[PDB]
Design an enzyme around this catalytic site. Structure first.
Site, mmCIF file in Angstrom:
data_model
loop_
_atom_site.group_PDB
_atom_site.id
_atom_site.type_symbol
_atom_site.label_atom_id
_atom_site.label_comp_id
_atom_site.label_asym_id
_atom_site.label_seq_id
_atom_site.Cartn_x
_atom_site.Cartn_y
_atom_site.Cartn_z
ATOM 1 N N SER A 1 31.126 -54.361 -28.341
ATOM 2 C CA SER A 1 30.193 -55.453 -28.133
ATOM 3 C C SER A 1 30.851 -56.522 -27.275
ATOM 4 C CB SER A 1 29.744 -56.047 -29.466
ATOM 5 O OG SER A 1 30.825 -56.677 -30.132
ATOM 6 N N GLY B 1 31.518 -59.974 -29.270
ATOM 7 C CA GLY B 1 32.597 -59.934 -30.235
ATOM 8 C C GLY B 1 33.958 -60.232 -29.646
ATOM 9 N N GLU C 1 31.044 -35.566 -14.548
ATOM 10 C CA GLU C 1 29.786 -35.494 -13.814
ATOM 11 C C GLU C 1 29.034 -36.818 -13.854
ATOM 12 O OE1 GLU C 1 28.535 -33.537 -11.717
ATOM 13 O OE2 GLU C 1 26.478 -32.898 -12.124
#
EC number: 3.6.5.-
Lengths: 107, 439, 427
Positions: free
Chosen positions: B140, B143, B254
């Site tokens: 986050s 945070g 990828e």
């Protein structure tokens, strides 16, 4: 300055504040709006608090300066400074009285 | 089989990790005990689930996840959760106190006290993997731990295993449910300190998720539970290309090959559709054209931006459920003809479709209705720079008067790095608008 | 797990702390003997933050009764919840500062603070992870002020990384005596400019105001003041002592509120405040709570919030409410009163929800706000203290205790700097 000057101004201040108190409580009898009632009540209660707490102790300090009784000695300049710190609050409370008058003349 | 261990850091990261691991177990038929039932061997013997899970000597499957947080309570809930026996105690690392929503605390002061232990556990898990493509990081932005320690881990992994694709997931702040006032500060701090080291970041817009799960999900006040539920749903939607045999995005490299042609443009847009509330679960299933038009609509987009104002760079389509390819081409042609889709001249990359036939599952008792055909569209556009425009002015409004900086300064990091981060973000937005204009 | 050591100093501070402990113990279902006779474990979720259990469910509060006069703890421990405290936390002097800052901080302060710090270390070593300290004291008394200042200074010296918030009970000229108290108050605030990471200002002017005209009481007594300030800190520490989405511990609170190193004074706010002769038998709705909370008639600081701008604010709501209208009313307040909020710190408004309301009111809502309007109390302190300086009013009572006028000069310099900084941030 002198100590009779202190007593004279003291009694003058108490007399005017108490006159404000009587006129406030006499005017409170009418059905003025609750906000105005609360403001007036706060003003008179603060005035009475200064009466019982500030003024009684301050006259105790006048007795301190006069009879030289208490913890330690005190001079007149300390009394002058004390009157200044009371004086800002008295100017404040008369200003509040002025705004109460302005509200009353508005309704 | 090409292993990809995942690192979950921060309070919100651990919560969304719990959600996505529950949903992985649900789709793969793995009970909380972790054993592999004979009737629940979903995948036809394919080790694509063995990519994320490790079988012990008793047949129990153990995920390659590293739950890391600086506060014990959030991982104490994990210990007391129904999946307690699924995760080994060594997998979960607890700190003695959180960073208190402070980047310098989560990066410089208390991060170094446990960075060595976290790295030791990660190396222990990696030594048992022979085809380790890279790492997926959940964290986050707001945070203090979720930004500071995430940046510290990113730098350590890059200096140690820089040849591995380090995919990342991030949580954008939101004023309604903002954890702190200083979210822009640590957001830009981790963005600057992780821009070069990361590979491809999937930001999750808490404003957008809140809006969609307030409107479509028929919930007036969504708590964290529903938010992390939907975030886990979209995370699994992304990772389904890896957890099963497929045609597109089979490996982690990828992702960067298709969506990040050049560095600093590694913030692709994610969209999930359809999403229907459980209270209206008995509605008609939308056809492929309808769900494609829905995911192209900003209503179901999960980051607050306007792609029409932007310029698409590269788009890839992931399909779950029984989806007809001819209908896919019809929908793509319709969207291209009606919706004005613009592509840069220098990059002739088109639209890529990868269809996975496994239908998507839902959490038991959740608000999300079971859907037989869902589409997740991942595209890169310069319109995402609107999020950075939201962040940079929010940062400058306080930086001009130099607010909240005494904590960061006193926690052992010089003030000039704030200006360095702001300059880096200015360069980033410069590259964004340069790609948007030079086309 | 984030346990806070709570320290109460001075006679008024110790009374205040004991009443606060009693009310929060009642809220947590704790009997006077320490045993838990409640109904739910939600209060037990973060009960260890303030309490310790030893093999008998006896939740002893982590409180320290410190005062240079031994009679204060004698009076406190005689109360219903005065004996629940740990006996080792009772540290009392044998001389007394005599309402003197110099004696209470330099010589007589140390001879007790050494034992107090020993007790604090004994508690902390048994505590797995301690985040901060809680201090309650009255700035009028020279004992508690000096003790607390010494505590904060040497704690910061020992633990620079351990945050600390305090409940400063600002006295009044109209409430207490006025002889040397302005000097002690100036020294105390000068210490608090740098020593404390956070500070809650509790002002006796507005305290008596609320206790008298809103509570409809002719002669306010210190007991009602104690009850009101205890309810105030109950509301304020609701965030710490109960779980919530915000998950605000001490450092989280300081980060989300304090924007600058020196601007660490907050004005509390409580609602509803009803007189005990007209108390409503119903519950106030969200708009009524909003318009009562933000009014100047609900702040324990005698400051006019309309005079200044709110730097960072937070609102803690307790009870059963539909928070949709809560967020609505907050955003209408933000739109309407945008001139009273600084625009250069985005998202400076915060809302927290709790499900356990205080006893006697089914619905309640408490407010903490960082505003620049608190500069006026610094101004009034200056009006008292400079007037006492120009005449050297009883300065020889402080010269003979090892305290010189240089410290008062540094105090007035710091006060003027804070006033100037607040004024410059007003714009």
């Amino acid at each position: 300055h002198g100590v009779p000057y202190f007593r004279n101004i003291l009694q003058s201040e108490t007399e005017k504040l108490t006159s404000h108190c009587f006129e406030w409580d006499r005017k409170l009898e009418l059905d003025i709006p609750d906000d105005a009632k609360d403001l007036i009540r706060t003003a008179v209660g603060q005035t009475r608090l200064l009466m019982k707490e500030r003024f009684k102790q301050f006259e105790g300090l006048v007795d301190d300066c006069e009879y030289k009784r208490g913890i330690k000695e005190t001079t007149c300049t300390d009394l002058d400074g004390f009157w200044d710190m009371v004086s800002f609050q008295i100017e404040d409370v008369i200003h509040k009285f002025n705004n109460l008058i302005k509200l009353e003349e508005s309704g | 089989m090409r292993e990809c261990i995942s690192i979950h850091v921060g309070q919100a990261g651990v919560q969304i990790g719990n959600a996505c691991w529950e949903l992985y177990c649900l789709e793969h038929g793995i009970q909380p005990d972790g054993q592999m039932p004979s009737d629940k061997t979903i995948g036809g013997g394919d080790d694509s689930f063995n990519t994320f899970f490790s079988e012990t000597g008793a047949g129990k499957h153990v995920p390659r996840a590293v739950f890391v947080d600086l506060e014990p309570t959030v991982i104490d809930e994990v210990r007391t959760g129904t999946y307690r026996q699924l995760f080994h105690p060594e997998q979960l690392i607890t700190g003695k106190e959180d960073a208190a929503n402070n980047y310098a605390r989560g990066h410089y002061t208390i991060g170094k006290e446990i960075i060595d232990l976290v790295l030791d556990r990660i190396r222990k898990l990696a030594d048992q993997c022979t085809g380790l493509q890279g790492f997926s990081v959940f964290h986050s932005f707001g945070g203090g731990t979720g930004s500071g320690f995430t940046s510290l881990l990113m730098e350590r992994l890059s200096v140690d295993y820089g040849k591995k694709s380090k995919l990342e997931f991030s949580i954008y702040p939101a004023p309604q449910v903002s954890t702190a006032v200083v979210e822009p500060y640590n957001s830009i701090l981790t963005t600057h300190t992780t821009l070069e080291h990361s590979d491809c970041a999937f930001m999750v817009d808490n404003e957008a998720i809140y809006d969609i799960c307030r409107r479509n999900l028929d919930i007036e006040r969504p708590t964290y539970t529903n938010l992390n539920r939907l975030i886990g749903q979209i995370v699994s939607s992304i990772t389904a290309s890896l957890r099963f045999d497929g045609a597109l995005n089979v490996d982690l490299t990828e992702f960067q090959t298709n969506l990040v042609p050049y560095p600093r443009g590694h913030f692709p847009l994610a969209t999930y559709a359809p999403v229907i509330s459980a209270e209206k679960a008995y509605h008609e299933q939308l056809s492929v054209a309808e769900i494609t038009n829905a995911c192209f609509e900003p209503a179901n987009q999960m980051v607050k931006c306007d792609p029409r104002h932007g310029k698409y760079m590269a788009c890839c389509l992931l399909y779950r459920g029984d989806v007809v390819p001819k209908d896919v081409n019809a929908a793509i042609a319709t969207i291209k003809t009606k919706r004005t889709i613009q592509f840069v001249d220098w990059c002739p990359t088109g639209f890529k479709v990868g269809i996975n036939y496994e239908p998507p599952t839902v959490v038991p008792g959740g608000d999300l209705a079971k859907v037989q055909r869902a589409v997740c569209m991942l595209s890169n556009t310069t319109a995402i720079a609107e999020a950075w425009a939201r962040l940079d002015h929010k940062f400058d409004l306080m930086y001009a008067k130099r607010a909240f900086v005494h904590w960061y300064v006193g926690e052992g990091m010089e003030e000039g790095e704030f200006s360095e981060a702001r300059e880096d973000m200015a360069a980033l937005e410069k590259d964004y608008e340069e790609v948007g204009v030079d086309s | 797990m984030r346990e806070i050591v709570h320290i109460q100093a001075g006679q008024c501070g110790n009374q205040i702390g004991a009443k606060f402990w009693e009310v929060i113990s009642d809220e947590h279902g704790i009997d006077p003997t320490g045993s838990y006779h409640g109904d739910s474990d939600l209060q037990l979720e973060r009960i260890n933050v303030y309490y310790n259990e030893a093999a008998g469910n006896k939740y002893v509060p982590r409180a320290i009764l410190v005062d240079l006069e031994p009679g204060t703890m004698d009076s406190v421990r005689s109360g219903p919840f005065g004996q629940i405290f740990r006996p080792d936390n009772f540290v009392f002097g044998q001389s007394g500062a005599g309402n003197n800052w110099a004696k209470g901080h330099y010589t007589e302060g140390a001879e007790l603070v050494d034992s107090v710090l020993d007790v604090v270390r004994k508690e902390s070593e048994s505590c797995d992870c301690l985040q901060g300290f809680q201090l309650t004291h009255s700035l009028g008394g020279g004992t508690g002020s000096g003790m607390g200042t010494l505590l904060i200074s040497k704690i910061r010296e020992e633990y620079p990384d351990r945050i600390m918030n305090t409940f400063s009970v600002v006295p009044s000229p109209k409430v207490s005596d006025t002889v040397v108290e302005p000097y002690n108050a100036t020294l105390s605030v000068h210490q608090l400019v740098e020593n404390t990471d956070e500070t809650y200002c509790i002002d006796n002017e507005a305290l008596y105001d609320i206790c008298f005209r809103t509570l409809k009481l002719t002669t306010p007594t210190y007991g009602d003041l104690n009850h009101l300030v205890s309810a105030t800190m109950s509301g304020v520490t609701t965030c710490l002592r109960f779980p919530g989405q915000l998950n605000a511990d001490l450092r989280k609170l300081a980060v989300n509120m304090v924007p600058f190193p020196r601007l660490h004074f907050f004005m509390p706010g409580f609602a509803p405040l009803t007189s005990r002769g007209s108390q409503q038998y119903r519950a106030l709705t969200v708009p009524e709570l909003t318009q009562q909370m933000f009014d100047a008639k609900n702040m324990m600081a005698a400051c006019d919030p309309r005079h200044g701008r709110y730097l960072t604010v937070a609102a803690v709501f307790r009870g059963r409410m539909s928070m949709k209208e809560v967020d609505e009313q907050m955003l209408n307040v933000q739109n309407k009163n945008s001139s009273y909020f600084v625009e250069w710190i985005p998202n400076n408004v915060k809302t927290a929800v709790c499900d356990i309301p205080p006893r006697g009111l089914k619905m309640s809502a408490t407010f903490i706000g960082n505003s620049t309007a608190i500069q006026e109390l610094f101004k009034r302190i200056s009006e008292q203290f400079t007037a006492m300086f120009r005449r050297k009013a009883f300065l020889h009572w402080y010269t003979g205790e090892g305290m010189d006028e240089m410290e008062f000069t540094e105090a007035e310099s710091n006060m003027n700097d804070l006033v100037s900084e607040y004024q410059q941030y007003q714009d």
